Short mmCIF file of N, CA and C in Angstrom, two decimals:
data_model
loop_
_atom_site.label_atom_id
_atom_site.label_comp_id
_atom_site.label_asym_id
_atom_site.label_seq_id
_atom_site.Cartn_x
_atom_site.Cartn_y
_atom_site.Cartn_z
N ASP A 1 1.04 -1.40 0.08
CA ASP A 1 0.31 0.27 0.17
C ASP A 1 0.75 1.38 0.03
N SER A 2 0.45 1.97 -0.84
CA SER A 2 1.16 3.69 -1.05
C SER A 2 0.00 4.91 -1.29
N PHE A 3 0.78 5.55 0.03
CA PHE A 3 -0.33 7.17 0.29
C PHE A 3 1.02 8.33 0.51
N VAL A 4 0.69 9.44 0.02
CA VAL A 4 1.36 10.53 0.28
C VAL A 4 1.26 11.23 2.23
N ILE A 5 1.90 11.08 2.91
CA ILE A 5 1.80 11.99 4.16
C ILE A 5 2.92 13.10 4.68
N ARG A 6 2.20 13.88 4.95
CA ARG A 6 3.29 15.00 5.68
C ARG A 6 4.47 13.98 6.72
N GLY A 7 4.85 15.27 6.81
CA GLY A 7 6.25 14.82 8.18
C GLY A 7 5.69 14.82 9.24
N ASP A 8 4.91 15.67 10.47
CA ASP A 8 4.63 14.87 11.32
C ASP A 8 2.81 13.87 11.39
N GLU A 9 2.76 13.79 10.52
CA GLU A 9 1.41 12.80 10.07
C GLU A 9 2.15 11.09 9.50
N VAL A 10 3.61 10.71 9.64
CA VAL A 10 4.66 9.64 9.33
C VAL A 10 4.39 9.01 10.37
N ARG A 11 4.47 9.54 12.46
CA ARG A 11 4.20 8.64 12.89
C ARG A 11 2.94 8.13 13.39
N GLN A 12 1.81 8.37 12.95
CA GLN A 12 0.73 8.26 12.82
C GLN A 12 0.53 7.19 12.49
N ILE A 13 1.03 7.22 11.53
CA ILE A 13 0.82 5.65 10.67
C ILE A 13 1.62 4.03 11.55
N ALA A 14 0.93 4.31 12.77
CA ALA A 14 1.70 2.96 12.73
C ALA A 14 0.73 1.79 14.16
N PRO A 15 0.46 0.80 14.43
CA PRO A 15 -0.22 0.12 14.88
C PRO A 15 -0.38 0.22 16.34
N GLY A 16 -1.85 0.62 16.41
CA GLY A 16 -2.75 1.13 18.19
C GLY A 16 -2.02 2.36 18.10
N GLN A 17 -1.58 3.09 17.65
CA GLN A 17 -1.07 4.79 17.89
C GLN A 17 -2.16 5.69 16.63
N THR A 18 -3.09 6.18 17.41
CA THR A 18 -4.19 7.29 17.00
C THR A 18 -3.80 8.37 16.42
N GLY A 19 -4.55 9.11 15.53
CA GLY A 19 -4.14 10.52 15.43
C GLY A 19 -5.49 11.10 14.76
N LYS A 20 -5.28 12.05 13.30
CA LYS A 20 -5.70 12.30 12.91
C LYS A 20 -6.07 11.81 11.38
N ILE A 21 -4.92 11.11 11.02
CA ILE A 21 -5.34 10.06 9.75
C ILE A 21 -5.82 8.93 9.30
N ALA A 22 -5.43 8.33 11.07
CA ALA A 22 -5.56 7.18 10.88
C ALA A 22 -6.60 6.72 11.64
N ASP A 23 -7.78 7.38 11.14
CA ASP A 23 -9.42 7.86 11.50
C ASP A 23 -10.04 7.46 10.70
N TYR A 24 -9.75 7.85 9.44
CA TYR A 24 -10.69 7.80 8.66
C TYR A 24 -10.43 7.69 6.98
N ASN A 25 -8.82 7.50 6.74
CA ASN A 25 -8.58 7.13 6.22
C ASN A 25 -7.31 5.59 5.49
N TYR A 26 -6.69 5.64 6.71
CA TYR A 26 -5.82 4.66 6.78
C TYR A 26 -5.41 4.04 8.27
N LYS A 27 -6.08 3.26 8.85
CA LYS A 27 -5.99 2.81 10.20
C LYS A 27 -5.35 1.29 10.56
N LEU A 28 -4.47 1.39 11.07
CA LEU A 28 -3.62 -0.26 11.35
C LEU A 28 -4.59 -0.92 12.80
N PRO A 29 -4.40 -1.51 13.05
CA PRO A 29 -4.83 -2.51 14.04
C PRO A 29 -4.11 -3.20 14.77
N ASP A 30 -4.02 -3.25 15.84
CA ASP A 30 -3.05 -4.23 16.32
C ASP A 30 -3.18 -5.70 15.95
N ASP A 31 -2.56 -6.15 14.94
CA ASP A 31 -2.63 -6.81 14.22
C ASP A 31 -0.81 -7.03 12.57
N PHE A 32 -0.60 -5.64 12.46
CA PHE A 32 -0.11 -5.82 11.73
C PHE A 32 0.91 -6.01 11.63
N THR A 33 1.21 -7.51 10.65
CA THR A 33 2.61 -8.32 11.25
C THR A 33 3.00 -7.70 9.92
N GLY A 34 3.40 -6.88 9.00
CA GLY A 34 4.08 -6.07 7.71
C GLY A 34 5.12 -5.75 8.24
N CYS A 35 5.31 -4.11 7.74
CA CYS A 35 6.50 -3.46 8.54
C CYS A 35 6.64 -2.16 7.61
N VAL A 36 6.36 -0.88 8.66
CA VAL A 36 6.31 0.11 7.76
C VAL A 36 7.53 0.78 6.72
N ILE A 37 7.21 0.98 6.01
CA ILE A 37 8.79 1.66 5.22
C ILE A 37 8.60 2.85 4.33
N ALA A 38 9.11 4.02 5.37
CA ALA A 38 8.78 5.45 4.70
C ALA A 38 10.28 6.10 4.07
N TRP A 39 10.09 7.49 3.28
CA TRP A 39 11.68 7.92 3.17
C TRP A 39 10.64 9.95 3.11
N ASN A 40 12.34 10.43 2.55
CA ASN A 40 11.51 11.21 2.40
C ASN A 40 11.39 11.84 0.91
N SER A 41 10.67 12.17 0.02
CA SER A 41 9.97 12.89 -0.98
C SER A 41 9.96 14.36 -1.50
N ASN A 42 10.82 15.75 -1.00
CA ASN A 42 10.46 16.53 -1.08
C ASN A 42 11.04 17.48 -2.43
N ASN A 43 11.16 16.19 -3.12
CA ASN A 43 12.43 16.63 -4.38
C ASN A 43 11.49 16.60 -5.37
N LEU A 44 10.46 15.85 -5.78
CA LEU A 44 10.04 15.17 -7.06
C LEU A 44 8.61 14.97 -6.37
N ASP A 45 8.44 15.35 -5.69
CA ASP A 45 6.34 15.95 -5.32
C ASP A 45 6.17 16.99 -5.47
N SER A 46 6.91 17.90 -4.82
CA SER A 46 6.68 19.27 -4.89
C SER A 46 7.35 20.00 -5.65
N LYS A 47 5.99 21.29 -5.65
CA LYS A 47 5.55 21.93 -6.45
C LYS A 47 5.90 23.81 -5.74
N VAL A 48 5.87 24.57 -6.48
CA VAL A 48 5.65 25.87 -6.61
C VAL A 48 4.07 26.36 -6.46
N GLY A 49 3.61 26.93 -5.36
CA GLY A 49 2.28 27.02 -5.06
C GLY A 49 1.47 26.14 -4.65
N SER B 1 -18.13 -20.61 73.35
CA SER B 1 -16.91 -21.45 72.99
C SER B 1 -16.96 -23.50 72.84
N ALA B 2 -18.15 -23.99 72.62
CA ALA B 2 -18.14 -25.25 72.46
C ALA B 2 -17.68 -25.74 71.34
N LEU B 3 -18.94 -24.96 69.88
CA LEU B 3 -18.54 -25.18 68.59
C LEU B 3 -17.58 -24.02 68.14
N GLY B 4 -16.60 -24.56 68.10
CA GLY B 4 -15.46 -23.75 67.80
C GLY B 4 -15.20 -24.76 66.45
N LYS B 5 -14.75 -25.15 66.50
CA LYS B 5 -14.23 -26.40 64.55
C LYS B 5 -15.76 -25.64 63.83
N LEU B 6 -16.45 -25.52 64.07
CA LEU B 6 -17.62 -26.03 62.78
C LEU B 6 -17.71 -23.68 62.39
N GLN B 7 -17.21 -23.45 63.67
CA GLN B 7 -17.67 -22.00 63.58
C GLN B 7 -16.27 -21.09 63.53
N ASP B 8 -15.20 -21.70 63.61
CA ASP B 8 -13.48 -21.59 62.80
C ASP B 8 -13.70 -21.38 61.17
N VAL B 9 -14.64 -23.01 61.01
CA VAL B 9 -14.57 -23.07 59.61
C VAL B 9 -15.36 -21.90 58.81
N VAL B 10 -16.58 -21.72 59.60
CA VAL B 10 -17.25 -20.70 58.58
C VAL B 10 -17.06 -19.82 58.38
N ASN B 11 -15.86 -19.01 59.37
CA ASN B 11 -14.93 -17.68 59.91
C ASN B 11 -14.52 -17.70 58.43
N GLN B 12 -13.77 -18.83 58.47
CA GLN B 12 -12.45 -18.81 57.18
C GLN B 12 -13.69 -18.85 55.84
N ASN B 13 -14.39 -19.65 55.95
CA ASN B 13 -14.93 -19.77 54.49
C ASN B 13 -15.17 -18.22 54.06
N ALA B 14 -15.98 -17.47 55.47
CA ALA B 14 -15.77 -16.19 54.95
C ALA B 14 -14.63 -15.22 54.75
N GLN B 15 -14.43 -14.98 55.61
CA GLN B 15 -12.74 -14.34 55.62
C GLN B 15 -12.53 -14.35 53.59
N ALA B 16 -12.11 -15.77 53.21
CA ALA B 16 -11.60 -16.35 52.25
C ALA B 16 -12.42 -15.36 50.26
N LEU B 17 -13.62 -15.95 51.19
CA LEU B 17 -14.15 -14.76 50.25
C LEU B 17 -14.30 -12.82 50.15
N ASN B 18 -14.59 -12.71 51.65
CA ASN B 18 -14.28 -11.19 51.08
C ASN B 18 -13.14 -10.67 51.30
N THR B 19 -11.84 -11.25 51.55
CA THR B 19 -10.97 -11.14 50.73
C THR B 19 -10.38 -11.42 49.47
N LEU B 20 -11.61 -12.33 48.62
CA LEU B 20 -11.71 -12.40 47.12
C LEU B 20 -11.92 -11.22 46.20
N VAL B 21 -13.65 -10.45 47.25
CA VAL B 21 -14.19 -10.44 46.53
C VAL B 21 -13.41 -8.78 46.85
N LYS B 22 -12.69 -8.27 47.42
CA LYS B 22 -11.41 -6.67 47.92
C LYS B 22 -10.41 -7.02 47.13
N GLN B 23 -9.74 -8.75 46.99
CA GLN B 23 -9.18 -8.42 45.82
C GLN B 23 -9.23 -7.79 44.71
N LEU B 24 -10.24 -8.40 43.74
CA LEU B 24 -11.29 -7.66 43.27
C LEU B 24 -10.79 -6.53 42.57
N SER B 25 -11.04 -5.52 43.80
CA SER B 25 -10.52 -4.14 43.64
C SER B 25 -9.71 -3.75 43.33
N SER B 26 -8.77 -4.16 43.53
CA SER B 26 -7.80 -3.85 43.88
C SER B 26 -7.06 -3.10 42.89
N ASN B 27 -6.28 -2.89 42.72
CA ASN B 27 -5.07 -1.21 41.58
C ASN B 27 -4.12 -3.01 40.58
N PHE B 28 -3.61 -3.73 41.62
CA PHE B 28 -2.62 -4.63 41.09
C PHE B 28 -1.71 -3.88 39.78
N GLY B 29 -1.02 -2.58 40.63
CA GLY B 29 -0.19 -1.62 39.39
C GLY B 29 -1.01 -0.85 38.68
N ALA B 30 -2.01 -0.71 38.48
CA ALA B 30 -3.08 0.51 37.10
C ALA B 30 -3.10 0.85 38.04
N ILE B 31 -3.76 2.29 36.88
CA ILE B 31 -4.27 3.64 37.55
C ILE B 31 -5.59 3.32 37.80
N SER B 32 -6.41 2.85 37.85
CA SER B 32 -7.81 1.96 38.33
C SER B 32 -7.26 0.79 38.85
N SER B 33 -9.36 0.80 39.11
CA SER B 33 -9.81 -0.35 39.14
C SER B 33 -10.98 -0.65 38.51
N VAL B 34 -11.57 -0.39 38.09
CA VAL B 34 -12.97 0.08 36.71
C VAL B 34 -12.81 0.24 35.79
N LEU B 35 -13.21 -1.14 34.98
CA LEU B 35 -12.69 -1.25 33.37
C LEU B 35 -13.73 -0.43 32.61
N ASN B 36 -14.38 0.04 32.99
CA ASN B 36 -14.87 0.82 32.37
C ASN B 36 -14.03 2.39 32.30
N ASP B 37 -13.55 3.15 33.15
CA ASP B 37 -12.64 3.98 33.03
C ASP B 37 -11.95 4.10 31.97
N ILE B 38 -11.16 3.02 31.89
CA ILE B 38 -9.78 2.39 31.93
C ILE B 38 -10.68 2.23 29.90
N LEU B 39 -11.64 1.64 29.89
CA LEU B 39 -11.66 1.88 28.64
C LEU B 39 -12.23 2.90 28.16
N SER B 40 -12.32 3.63 28.31
CA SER B 40 -12.96 4.78 27.82
C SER B 40 -12.29 5.91 28.10
N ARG B 41 -10.97 6.69 29.05
CA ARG B 41 -10.29 7.17 29.26
C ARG B 41 -8.58 6.55 28.49
N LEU B 42 -8.35 6.26 27.82
CA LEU B 42 -7.56 5.53 27.76
C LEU B 42 -7.12 5.07 26.32
N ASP B 43 -5.96 5.08 25.30
CA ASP B 43 -6.12 4.95 24.41
C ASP B 43 -6.08 3.26 24.57
N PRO B 44 -6.19 3.22 22.69
CA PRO B 44 -6.24 1.66 22.93
C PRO B 44 -5.26 0.55 23.62
N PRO B 45 -3.87 0.85 23.32
CA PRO B 45 -2.55 0.26 22.96
C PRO B 45 -2.10 0.52 24.83
N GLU B 46 -2.80 1.50 25.44
CA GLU B 46 -2.57 1.65 27.22
C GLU B 46 -3.46 0.69 27.53
N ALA B 47 -4.86 1.29 27.09
CA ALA B 47 -5.78 0.35 27.22
C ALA B 47 -5.96 -1.28 27.40
N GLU B 48 -5.30 -1.91 26.31
CA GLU B 48 -5.20 -3.03 26.21
C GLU B 48 -3.92 -3.91 27.72
N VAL B 49 -3.08 -2.53 27.69
CA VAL B 49 -1.85 -2.77 28.81
C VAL B 49 -2.08 -3.49 29.82
#
């Protein structure tokens, strides 16, 4: 699964840890036997304006 | 004081029941002793902990 979030919203994507994004868009239960991967993408996804 | 053994057995059973009901209302190292206030005033991870 792939999605784009801001900096402060990265820590909210975690098993059990709630917030603002993990309530109506992408919720992870306490059974996530995957592994999150994330990196910075402020070089090809951002533009002026 | 003649009826001692039966009275002692009854008192021991009553004390065991009382201490069991008292231990049910213990903290055991938690913040409270009621489950509703724990499931309603805590995030799911700390709640299940």
